[PDB]
Design a protein around this motif. Structure first.
Motif, PDB file in Angstrom:
ATOM      1  N   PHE A 156      -6.712  -0.537  11.326  1.00 20.86           N
ATOM      2  CA  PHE A 156      -7.672  -1.819  10.997  1.00 20.86           C
ATOM      3  C   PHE A 156      -6.726  -2.916  11.155  1.00 20.86           C
ATOM      4  CE2 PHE A 156      -9.092   1.816   7.848  1.00 20.86           C
ATOM      5  CZ  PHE A 156     -10.369   1.946   8.089  1.00 20.86           C
TER       6      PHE A 156
ATOM      7  N   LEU B 236       0.746  -1.052  -0.094  1.00 19.45           N
ATOM      8  CA  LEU B 236      -0.078  -0.169   0.071  1.00 19.45           C
ATOM      9  C   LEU B 236       0.900   1.128   0.062  1.00 19.45           C
ATOM     10  CD1 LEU B 236      -1.817  -1.181   2.898  1.00 19.45           C
ATOM     11  CD2 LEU B 236      -2.638  -1.347   0.772  1.00 19.45           C
ATOM     12  N   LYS B 237       0.108   2.185  -0.371  1.00 19.77           N
ATOM     13  CA  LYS B 237       0.675   3.733  -0.492  1.00 19.77           C
ATOM     14  C   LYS B 237      -0.097   4.335   0.778  1.00 19.77           C
ATOM     15  CE  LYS B 237       0.133   1.588  -3.073  1.00 19.77           C
ATOM     16  NZ  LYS B 237      -0.475   0.496  -3.950  1.00 19.77           N
ATOM     17  N   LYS B 238       0.858   5.129   1.673  1.00 21.45           N
ATOM     18  CA  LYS B 238      -0.115   5.664   2.852  1.00 21.45           C
ATOM     19  C   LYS B 238      -0.893   6.775   2.480  1.00 21.45           C
ATOM     20  CE  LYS B 238       3.123   9.286   4.045  1.00 21.45           C
ATOM     21  NZ  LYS B 238       4.107  10.051   5.029  1.00 21.45           N
TER      22      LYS B 238
ATOM     23  N   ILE C 111     -10.201   2.705  -3.360  1.00 24.58           N
ATOM     24  CA  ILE C 111     -11.128   1.662  -2.865  1.00 24.58           C
ATOM     25  C   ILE C 111     -10.712   0.244  -2.839  1.00 24.58           C
ATOM     26  CG2 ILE C 111     -13.557   1.070  -2.158  1.00 24.58           C
ATOM     27  CD1 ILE C 111     -14.344   3.590  -4.098  1.00 24.58           C
TER      28      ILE C 111
ATOM     29  N   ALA D  75      -8.361   7.002   6.218  1.00 24.49           N
ATOM     30  CA  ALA D  75      -8.722   5.628   5.676  1.00 24.49           C
ATOM     31  C   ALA D  75     -10.218   5.361   6.467  1.00 24.49           C
ATOM     32  CB  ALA D  75      -7.935   4.629   6.122  1.00 24.49           C
TER      33      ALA D  75
ATOM     34  N   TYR E 291     -12.898  -0.587   2.181  1.00 24.47           N
ATOM     35  CA  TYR E 291     -12.013   0.299   2.462  1.00 24.47           C
ATOM     36  C   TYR E 291     -11.526   1.392   1.699  1.00 24.47           C
ATOM     37  CZ  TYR E 291     -11.339  -3.741   5.894  1.00 24.47           C
ATOM     38  OH  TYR E 291     -11.463  -4.727   6.592  1.00 24.47           O
TER      39      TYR E 291
HETATM   40  C1  LIG Z   1      -6.228  -4.021   2.833  1.00 26.41           C
HETATM   41  C2  LIG Z   1      -6.744  -2.990   3.840  1.00 26.41           C
HETATM   42  C3  LIG Z   1      -7.586  -3.220   4.723  1.00 26.41           C
HETATM   43  C4  LIG Z   1      -6.638  -1.388   3.359  1.00 26.41           C
HETATM   44  C5  LIG Z   1      -7.259  -0.406   3.834  1.00 26.41           C
HETATM   45  O1  LIG Z   1      -6.111   0.135   4.817  1.00 26.41           O
HETATM   46  C6  LIG Z   1      -5.375   1.039   4.542  1.00 26.41           C
HETATM   47  C7  LIG Z   1      -4.908   1.381   3.047  1.00 26.41           C
HETATM   48  C8  LIG Z   1      -4.031   2.115   2.790  1.00 26.41           C
HETATM   49  N1  LIG Z   1      -3.611   2.488   1.384  1.00 26.41           N
HETATM   50  C9  LIG Z   1      -4.113   2.103   0.008  1.00 26.41           C
HETATM   51  S1  LIG Z   1      -3.064   2.071  -1.250  1.00 26.41           S
HETATM   52  C10 LIG Z   1      -5.317   1.775  -0.007  1.00 26.41           C
HETATM   53  C11 LIG Z   1      -6.764   2.734   0.535  1.00 26.41           C
HETATM   54  C12 LIG Z   1      -7.972   1.987   0.356  1.00 26.41           C
HETATM   55  O2  LIG Z   1      -7.619   0.601  -0.533  1.00 26.41           O
HETATM   56  C13 LIG Z   1      -6.188   0.725  -0.664  1.00 26.41           C
HETATM   57  C14 LIG Z   1      -5.721  -0.320  -1.217  1.00 26.41           C
HETATM   58  C15 LIG Z   1      -3.340   3.177   3.565  1.00 26.41           C
HETATM   59  C16 LIG Z   1      -3.932   2.897   5.073  1.00 26.41           C
HETATM   60  C17 LIG Z   1      -4.693   1.896   5.568  1.00 26.41           C
HETATM   61 CL1  LIG Z   1      -5.053   1.752   7.110  1.00 26.41          CL
END
Ligand SMILES: CC(C)=CCOc1cc(NC(=S)c2ccoc2C)ccc1Cl
Lengths: 525, 404
Positions: free
Chosen positions: A224, A97-99, A177, A103, A185
């Motif tokens: 999460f 993931l990218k921060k 998403i 979220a 998410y």
């Molecule tokens: C897999 C998962 C539970 C993702 C949701 O949690 C996060 C995901 C991201 N960053 C990305 S790139 C993102 C956001 C929504 O879906 C994605 C793939 C960053 C912080 C958190 Cl806490």
């Protein structure tokens, strides 16, 4: 609404025709209430006696309420339903993931129940609510939407969610998403309100197609906890890991521990389970108690300290490069860490995979490189620049002479002992003035020397290696050895530096000591 | 138009092959590619009611800055019904001096695919780190790389080539999957022009060069006979290496005798001790040497048997291969001379192209490399439009010694 996905039963199969089990007048009452509500909502529809199919139904009260829940057993229908494209069998590893600045997870209430079912398939979803009074016969229904518990529900739902989400995703590239079963998410780098704002646009867009989700009030907030992780908008870690303080350990306890210890390795550098694992040798029952060795408690204790201090991996910055660094943690043990900013770990990990009974560090380190590469492509879609404790000269020398083809990306030598090297090399040509041993369990030399030792409990292949061992043993700093064992040859020509076989390690030992060794093969008879 | 009904071999179901992980670059490429093929209706997104799958890859075109989408229809072709008029293999092709290969896959995209077969052509564009469902598609037109496509387009194909074929019957034209093998004996210059003309003669009806755009030369292909060391003095070691190789080769050419050479090896002499050769031994070596000068007699190719290929890494950028159907009964043997993987893949494609040209079929390769490595890099150097079948092996240090 949503476009229906055409479904079919597996070729040459008819819909389920299974009897409704007997129910309590109490449970009948419950179901009827539940089913009527459902009909009023269009989820199901009373049907004529024209339908010969049937799937059982029963009533259940889940953990907390004196209210009734409806369960329909689709085992049969499912054994009869066509296979679908797999639901997301692959998942995102946190380091990928990218921060995001914010979220938000949105639970999708009444997922399946918000999605139509292929008209032509509904008939197979028939169930019956028995009548309370005998001479006065039961209610027949069929589903109009995705039946919870059905084979295609998950897949068809995921599918629909995507089509629904597409538009929005296009009108909002600044948003990300990740669909996952019932949760949705969403991350953005929008300012708090700005973000919390879109979260609300989304809900509307979803609600537009009847899908409901929890309100800001009732939503779950980061971190999460997901799939054994703890996800923050800016960092990640494995959830909490506490080690027991027992004084009495059973094979099972130890197995659980090693297992949890294994898990940690992807993020906690330096976890070791070698000594613990040893405790499993010869064990006779899951409940057998094994006493810890001096060396095993040190490890447990050492690990305990590692786990005490939390660590957190940072997220992936697609703008920056990936660097993978590997170190030898011990014979067969390798450790690596992938970071972008120095020691700013995205992930870390171990590698013990010994491919073949015999190996050398160059071969293994290379395999390590392959596992890491495969892993990376899966997470970041690109391979990292490697920082390896081996010199190109060494690498090239091994590479160039090994029969198998191999290739290592771009790597940079790193002087971080221990350095991997070849502890020895077989001469390419027979050595002059070096005695020549002809082994077959014994040897004969050009200088008249011989020993015909006779082994017991030895295999055919193992006897061959013995001879060679003998020759090595007795010879001087330079030897010419002649064998007819194509097996021994391959082993040694592979130039292992570590082996499961003791015998082989003894020889390797001899081999490292020698000045020059020339091994040659000759046909038997 | 009218689609011709195609069916899988009886009782067989469609492919459900796993998609191997792709690099963002390749993924981005395929997306770009597929999005346009969709706009033009060659493909369409699919639903979860389709469980089938075929792997897609992206490869580079030689001397073209564009990416080619490559679909691994290997399992599909295997489960696809055979086809019952064929355009047999022109033995005249292997002999031709020059041959050029042209990618004609774009032809297929003008013929619709039977609506009931389409589902079996499902393939998927993977997503990095599984953050998205993965774009799912299926073909509506004949797809590039399917065995049916050349068959179903045969007619329409012979048509467009009857004129050049009679207005230029000095040229041999073979079609294999997405490829067209144009052969002649004209000067390399004449060749290139007659070629270009066929390009437009094809453009006229609706072909970038293959194998570097470049040329091929089947006339100059020859077998790599087993060779022996021809040296000044012969040491004990030399002679053992000799007898070993000989003994091995005796299984093929039973005329090889070692008796006289094995007699110089009596006693437990010092490996470095030079051994002058007796008269008998001298004649023996020579005879063995004569026998090896040519491929063993009696080995003929059987259309009903698989064509197998084994590769050996020799070193210094040098490889040795052998194409046979039965052990020791080689139909061909060759040599090939960056990094290990890049070489190997160039060699594989080379050997495949030869198999196609010589026999009209691809070989089943045995590669000296670990699967994950191959899976990882092969698409980085691959340029063919077809994909031979392959498996992975552990080369015995002796066989390598016995070749080159
Ligand atoms: C897999 C998962 C539970 C993702 C949701 O949690 C996060 C995901 C991201 N960053 C990305 S790139 C993102 C956001 C929504 O879906 C994605 C793939 C960053 C912080 C958190 Cl806490």
């Amino acid at each position: 609404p949503i476009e229906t996905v055409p479904v079919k039963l597996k070729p040459g199969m008819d819909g389920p025709k299974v009897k409704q089990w007997p129910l309590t007048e109490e449970k009948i009452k419950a179901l009827v209430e539940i089913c009527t509500e459902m009909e009023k909502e269009g989820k199901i529809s009373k049907i004529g006696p024209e339908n010969p199919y049937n799937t059982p139904v029963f009533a259940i009260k889940k953990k907390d309420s004196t209210k009734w829940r409806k369960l329909v057993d689709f085992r049969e229908l499912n054994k009869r339903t066509q296979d679908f494209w797999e639901v997301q069998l692959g998942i995102p590893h946190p380091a990928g993931l990218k921060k995001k600045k914010s979220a938000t997870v949105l639970d999708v209430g009444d997922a399946y129940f918000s999605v139509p079912l292929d008209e032509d398939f509904r008939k197979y979803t028939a169930f019956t609510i028995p009548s309370i009074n005998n001479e006065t016969p039961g209610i027949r229904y069929q589903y109009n939407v995705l039946p919870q518990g059905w084979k295609g529900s998950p897949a068809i739902f995921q599918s629909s969610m995507t089509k629904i989400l597409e538009p929005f995703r296009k009108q909002n590239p600044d948003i990300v998403i990740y669909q996952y079963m019932d949760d949705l998410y969403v991350g953005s780098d929008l300012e708090i309100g700005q973000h919390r704002t879109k979260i609300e646009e989304l809900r509307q867009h979803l609600l537009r197609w009847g899908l409901t989700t929890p309100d800001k009030k009732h939503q779950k907030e980061p971190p999460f906890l997901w799939m054994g992780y703890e996800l923050h908008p800016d960092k990640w870690t494995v959830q909490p890991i506490v080690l027991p303080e027992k004084d009495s350990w059973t094979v099972n306890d130890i197995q659980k521990l090693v297992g949890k210890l294994n898990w940690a390795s992807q993020i906690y550098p330096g976890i070791k389970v070698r000594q613990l694992c040893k405790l499993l040798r010869g064990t006779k029952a899951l409940t057998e108690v094994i006493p810890l060795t001096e060396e095993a408690e040190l490890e447990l204790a050492e690990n305990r300290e590692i786990l005490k201090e939390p660590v957190h991996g940072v997220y992936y910055d697609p703008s920056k490069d990936l660097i993978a660094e590997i170190q030898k943690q011990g014979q067969g043990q390798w450790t690596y860490q992938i970071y972008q900013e120095p020691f700013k770990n995205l992930k870390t990990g171990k590698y013990a995979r010994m491919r073949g009974a015999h190996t050398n560090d160059v071969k293994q380190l290379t395999e390590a490189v392959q596992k890491i590469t495969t892993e990376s492509i899966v997470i970041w879609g690109k391979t990292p620049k490697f920082k390896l404790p081996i010199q190109k000269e060494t690498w090239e020398t091994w590479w160039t002479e090994y029969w198998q083809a191999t290739w290592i990306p771009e790597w940079e030598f790193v002087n971080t002992p221990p350095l991997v090297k070849l502890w020895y090399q077989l001469e390419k040509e027979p050595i002059v003035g070096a005695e020549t041993f002809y082994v077959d369990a014994g040897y004969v030399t050009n200088r008249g020397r011989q020993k015909v030792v006779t082994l017991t409990d030895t295999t055919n292949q193992k006897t061959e290696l013995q001879a060679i061992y003998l020759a090595l043993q007795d010879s001087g700093l330079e030897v010419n050895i002649v064998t007819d064992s194509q097996y021994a040859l391959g082993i040694i020509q592979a130039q292992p530096d570590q082996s499961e076989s003791e015998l082989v390690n003894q020889i390797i030992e001899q081999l490292i000591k020698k000045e020059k060794v020339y091994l040659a093969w000759v046909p038997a008879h | 138009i009218e689609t011709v009904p195609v069916k899988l071999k009886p009782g067989m179901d469609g492919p459900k092959v796993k998609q191997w992980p792709l690099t963002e670059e390749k993924i981005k490429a395929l997306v770009e590619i597929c999005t346009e093929m969709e706009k033009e209706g060659k493909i369409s997104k699919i639903g979860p009611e389709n469980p089938y799958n075929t792997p897609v890859f992206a490869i580079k075109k030689k001397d073209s800055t564009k990416w080619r989408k490559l679909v691994d229809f290997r399992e599909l072709n295997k489960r696809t019904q055979d086809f019952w008029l064929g355009i047999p293999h022109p033995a005249g092709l292997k002999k031709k001096k020059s041959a050029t290969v042209l990618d004609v896959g774009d032809a297929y995209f003008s013929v619709p695919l039977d609506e009931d077969f389409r589902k079996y052509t499902a393939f998927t564009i993977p997503s990095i780190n599984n953050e998205t469902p993965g774009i799912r598609y299926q073909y509506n037109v004949l797809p590039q790389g399917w065995k049916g496509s050349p068959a179903i387009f045969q007619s329409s194909m012979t048509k467009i080539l009857e004129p050049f074929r009679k207005q230029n019957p000095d040229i041999v034209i073979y079609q294999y999957m997405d490829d067209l093998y144009v052969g002649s004996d004209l000067e390399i210059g004449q060749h290139r022009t007659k070629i270009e003309e066929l390009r437009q003669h094809l453009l006229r009806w609706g072909p970038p060069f293959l194998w570097m755009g470049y040329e091929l030369h089947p006339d100059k292909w020859t077998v790599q006979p087993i060779v022996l060391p021809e040296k000044d003095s012969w040491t004990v070691n030399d002679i053992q290496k000799l007898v070993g190789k000989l003994n091995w080769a005796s299984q093929i050419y039973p005329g090889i005798k070692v008796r006289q050479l094995c007699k110089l090896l009596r006693g437990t002499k010092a490996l470095t001790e030079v051994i002058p050769l007796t008269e008998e031994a001298e004649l023996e070596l020579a005879e063995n040497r004569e026998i090896l000068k040519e491929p063993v007699h009696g080995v003929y190719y059987d259309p009903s048997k698989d064509l197998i290929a084994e590769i050996q890494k020799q070193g210094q950028g040098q490889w040795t291969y052998q194409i046979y159907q039965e052990p020791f009964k080689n139909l061909k043997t060759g040599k090939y001379a960056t990094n290990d993987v890049k070489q190997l893949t160039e060699a594989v494609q080379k050997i495949t192209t030869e198999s196609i040209v010589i026999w009209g079929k691809t070989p089943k390769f045995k590669l000296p490399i670990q699967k994950e490595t191959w899976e990882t890099w092969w698409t980085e150097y691959w340029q063919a439009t077809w994909i031979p079948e392959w498996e992975f092996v552990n080369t015995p240090p002796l066989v390598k010694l016995w070749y080159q």
